[PDB]
Design a protein around this nucleic acid. Structure first.
Ligand SMILES: [K+]
Ligand SMILES: [K+]
Ligand SMILES: [Mg+2]
Ligand SMILES: [Mg+2]
Ligand SMILES: [Mg+2]
Ligand SMILES: [Mg+2]
Ligand SMILES: [Mg+2]
Length: 53
RNA sequence: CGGAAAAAUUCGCCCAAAUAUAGGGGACAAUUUUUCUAGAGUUUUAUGUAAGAAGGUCGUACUCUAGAGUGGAGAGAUAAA
């Protein structure tokens, strides 16, 4: 019983009055932590070689 | 003691104890793996510069010697001697 009660609370939904009152944070900033490789990493590297030469 | 974004492992950490069997949660922590470039470095003779060291010099003054030099009784010192 002590385990179910504690596990239920840690995975409970936020309060409604907390949802309809808290300001908005764009998901582009609050969830985009992953940093992928530059898709143009190969094109840029080929242009940087020409400019450096 | 110390970056970024992920992953494996410990199950550290937390529920959480009774020195807790067995599990759950994944932010953080430890070992490790793969990527990243903001820290740290390398190249592109920088400029500027009384850091350092070696081998040689220059000059102003000083000093000694010589010219039986010129001159012929003072000089120097001190607040004064
Ligand atoms: K665990
Ligand atoms: K863990
Ligand atoms: Mg790499
Ligand atoms: Mg690069
Ligand atoms: Mg740098
Ligand atoms: Mg120079
Ligand atoms: Mg004479």
């Amino acid at each position: 019983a002590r385990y179910l009660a504690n596990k239920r609370a840690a995975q409970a939904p936020e309060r409604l009055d907390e949802v309809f009152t808290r300001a908005t944070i764009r998901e582009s900033t609050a969830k985009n932590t992953f940093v992928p490789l530059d898709p143009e990493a190969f094109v840029k590297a080929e242009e940087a070689r020409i400019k450096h030469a």
